[PDB]
């Protein structure tokens, strides 16, 4: 079960950019694998021509074979060059299909000349692409991390995680949505519940609440802001904590709630609103998930997804929540090559 | 223990508005007593002076081992100092030395109990889980205390029916309020607070004001009522197509709250009556999800809704009966209690020193 063209290669199409991981062997005995290795260094240096070369696995072992798996990110406007450039190079992988996954997939294949594409589903090479790096490690090193001392984002640092044996697992995958997989081994996963509030809610109600253009931009301001100028507090209705209930008086009683007084609405900044809205939605995914965690009787919780690819304010904050949820005894994990398990995903389904 | 005053009632304290529950016995052996019922009426008829709480009123009950009707009233804050001079003016031996009462106001008030009275403060949830479980107890004039909504999955066509909670053991009740707080009730001495959200009523009405510029619930309750929640809303079949075959969603299931608002194009043809029903869509949506959570870890699989999110319009409990029927896939009910807004006041009342 090895792949029948050269070089191999798994594609993750966006709207906007494409996500490629590609294998470079390192034992070379013909002229025109040496050929093929040398087009794709030209190829990789044309495409990221204006991170991802630090992600490079040196000397693993794919099908069989020994070599380096690359990453790297282009815009999809360039996908029908690095096509045409495979044709141009003789790459027998580049003529009689395309096998990709990722929203971007399917409007391509009508974009481009002659193609067929291989629709692949994006869960599906995610989960493929994430075991896979999880089972080679990261040059030695870990693949895996948390945030210690996750109960002070301003304080927390990155650890290692050793998370060797990864089964069983809960992968809470956030984009627009939110969808929580559990995985018990390789083939055998699914999804066991979700929740529509993801990154989509919280750039949704940014772009109508602040007027930003951009997830960037309004993770931007949420960084500058102060989320309690809008939420109320458990000591805005206690004057301190919730005793009986023991609940803190600084956990957030209401989300949004001070803004149903006419005072507070008219002096709260763009970038508090921009804050309290991250902030409400990474609480309330640590909370599903920790509830899921304790359901599926799964420890083990690891993010992925657009949402973590900015800032990692995003990733912080999902650490913060999941601690506090679970009274410390989870952390939240999260992984070195997030946003490239797709590509590798595709890569390992070409054969 | 039966408690020591008469006659018995008890009063949730809110900022604006008191909510009185108070005990009328059937069976009055001494004129003093019938001179205390008496007075309780003309009490009644002057703070509810300047028709939902008359019909609330459970008749032919029984309390402490005595028969009688347990009447509900809502009024004024301005006029609790008129109530209490009215029961120290008509001897009323449960105003003689300390007032025990619930509620947001009720420190506020303090001064005024002028007075030698003290305040022993209850708290509200205490007084919530009591009130609840004594009216589940006694029903609605036999009619049901407790209701559900038949075809939960359709809104348009759902139906307000009764449903039988006997044995109300173990329930796990969901208090929505600004925020959420779910608690599991294992028997009337043993309940807990499991969890809870701070995606509550106070996020809907602070949203919706932002959003849309409501100046109150029931104003963004009705904006919500003629809005249509998927133009602000990502679904399903928006990144799909259609339905997600391969992990079990329907094309129609929300796949990103507020999801579409990232377009401009979208953003600008929105409605403030779409943004309004998103909002609350948004927050049932996850409320029912919780909840439903919270059912299947605590294993009960009776939920009860309750708490001021409830009391201005059907819609946000229709819209919770829609979201727990779709996250339990049918198995649970959302249910319901008529005597909703009144159970601190009647937990009061059962929190009387004895
Ligand atoms: C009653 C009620 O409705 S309550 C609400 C219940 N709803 C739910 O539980 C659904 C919650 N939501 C979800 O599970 C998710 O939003 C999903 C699964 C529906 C969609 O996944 P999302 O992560 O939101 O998709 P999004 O459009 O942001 O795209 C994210 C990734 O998927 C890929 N993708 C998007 N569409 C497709 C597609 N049609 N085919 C293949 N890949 C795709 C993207 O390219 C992107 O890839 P990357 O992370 O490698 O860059
Ligand atoms: C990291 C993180 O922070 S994740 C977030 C975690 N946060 C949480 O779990 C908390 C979520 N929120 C909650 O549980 C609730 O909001 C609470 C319990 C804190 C507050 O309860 P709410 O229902 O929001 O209070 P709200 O002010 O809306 O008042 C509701 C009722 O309680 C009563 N009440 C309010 N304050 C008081 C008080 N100080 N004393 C007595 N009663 C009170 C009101 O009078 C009102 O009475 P009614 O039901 O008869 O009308």
Not at 45 to 72: A, C, M, P, Q, W
Not at 119 to 144: P, R, T
Not at 178 to 188: F, G, R
Not at 234 to 251: C, K, S
């Amino acid at each position: 079960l090895v792949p029948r063209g050269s070089p191999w290669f798994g594609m993750d199409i966006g709207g906007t950019l494409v996500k490629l991981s590609y294998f470079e062997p390192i034992d070379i005995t013909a002229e025109e694998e040496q050929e093929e290795v040398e087009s794709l260094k030209s190829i990789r240096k044309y495409l990221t021509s204006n991170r991802d070369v630090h992600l490079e696995l040196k000397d693993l072992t794919l099908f069989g074979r020994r070599g380096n798996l690359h990453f790297i990110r282009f815009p999809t406007q360039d996908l029908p060059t690095f096509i045409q450039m495979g044709r141009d190079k003789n790459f027998s992988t580049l003529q009689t299909v395309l096998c990709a996954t990722g929203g971007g997939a399917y409007k391509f294949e009508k974009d481009f000349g002659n193609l067929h594409l291989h629709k692949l589903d994006e869960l599906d090479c995610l989960v493929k692409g994430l075991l896979y790096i999880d089972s080679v490690s990261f040059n030695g090193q870990a693949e895996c991390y948390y945030f210690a001392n996750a109960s002070e984002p301003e304080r927390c640092q990155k650890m290692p995680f050793n998370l060797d044996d990864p089964y069983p697992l809960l992968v809470v995958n956030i984009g627009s949505g939110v969808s929580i997989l559990a995985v018990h081994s390789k083939d055998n996963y699914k999804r066991v519940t979700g929740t529509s509030l993801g990154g989509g809610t919280f750039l949704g109600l940014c772009s109508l609440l602040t007027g930003c253009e951009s997830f960037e931009e309004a993770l931007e301001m949420a960084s500058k802001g102060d989320s309690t100028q809008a939420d109320k507090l458990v000591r805005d209705i206690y004057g301190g904590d919730y005793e009986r209930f023991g609940l803190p008086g600084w956990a957030v009683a209401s989300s949004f709630g001070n803004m149903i007084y006419k005072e507070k609405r008219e002096s709260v900044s763009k970038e508090d609103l921009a804050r309290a809205t991250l902030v409400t939605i990474t609480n309330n995914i640590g909370s599903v998930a920790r509830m899921c965690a304790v359901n599926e009787k799964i420890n083990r919780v690891v993010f992925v997804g657009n949402f973590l690819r900015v800032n990692t304010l995003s990733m912080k904050l999902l650490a913060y929540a999941l601690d506090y949820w679970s009274k410390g005894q989870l952390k939240a994990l999260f992984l070195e090559h997030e946003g490239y398990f797709g590509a590798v995903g595709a890569l390992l389904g070409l054969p």
